[PDB]
């Protein structure tokens, strides 16, 4: 699959609830789910090597990884973690995360490219799943 593109969000389900069950305070949740925080996602894929930039009005997040090689990022609540992405199937990657410091809920994410070119993202903490869907600009 080729995940490359500039992706715009078209569906978001259970995001604030994920943050809430994770202990994020209401002032921060409000900011995090406001229109000003609507994420635009740029992906550059070169085979198994990925660059993913997520942009909001106030923040840029950039990750660089190759499938099967450990890399650093932050969990959805901003805690540094060691991440590892594997292909679950031809069109879907899954990332396992390990906190660099301390214990905490089991967090993960996935990205899947559909036949008609939609991008499905999931983010999980224990038994709570958030789903976002994007289309290319």
Ligand X SMILES: *C/C=C(C)/C=C/C=C1/N(C)c2ccccc2C1(C)C
- The residues that touch ligand X, with contacts defined as CB under 6 A, are 9, 12, 15, 32-35, 37-39, 132
Residue 36 near residue 57, CB atoms below 8 Å: yes
Which CB atom, from 65 or from 132, has the smaller least distance to ligand X? 132
Q: In angstroms, what is the minimal distance from the CB of 36 to ligand X?
A: 8
Q: In angstroms, what is the minimal distance from the CB of 110 to ligand X?
A: 15
Which CB atom, from 98 or from 136, has the smaller least distance to ligand X? 136
Q: In angstroms, what is the minimal distance from the CB of 80 to ligand X?
A: 20
Residue that has been written with the tokens 């999980």 in this structure = 124
Which CB atom, from 16 or from 96, has the smaller least distance to ligand X? 16
Residue 28 CA, chain-centre distance (Å), reads 18
Between vectors from CA 92 to CA 89 and to CA 97, what angle results, nearest 5°? 105
Name which of 96, 73, 77 is nearest 16 in CA terms. Answer: 77
Q: In angstroms, what is the minimal distance from the CB of 58 to ligand X?
A: 11
Q: In angstroms, what is the minimal distance from the CB of 23 to ligand X?
A: 17
Which CB atom, from 86 or from 136, has the smaller least distance to ligand X? 136
Name which of 92, 95, 102, 33 is nearest 69 in CA terms. Answer: 95
Enter the DSSP assignment of 58.
S
Enter the DSSP assignment of 29.
H
Which CB atom, from 38 or from 44, has the smaller least distance to ligand X? 38
Question: In the complex, which residue's CB is closest to ligand X?
Answer: 12
């Amino acid at each position: 699959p080729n995940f490359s593109g500039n992706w715009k969000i078209i569906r978001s389900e259970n995001f604030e609830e994920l943050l809430k069950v994770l202990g994020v305070n209401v002032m921060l949740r409000k900011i995090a789910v406001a229109a000003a925080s609507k994420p635009a996602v740029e992906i550059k894929q070169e085979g198994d090597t990925f660059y993913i930039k997520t942009s909001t009005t106030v923040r840029t997040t950039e990750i660089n990884f190759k499938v099967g090689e450990e890399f650093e990022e932050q969990t959805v609540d901003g805690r540094p973690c060691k991440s590892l992405v594997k292909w679950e199937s031809e069109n879907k990657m899954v990332c396992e995360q390990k906190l660099l410091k301390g214990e905490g809920p089991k967090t993960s994410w996935t990205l899947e490219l559909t036949n008609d070119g939609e991008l499905i993202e999931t983010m999980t903490a224990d038994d709570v799943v958030c789903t976002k869907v994007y289309v290319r600009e």
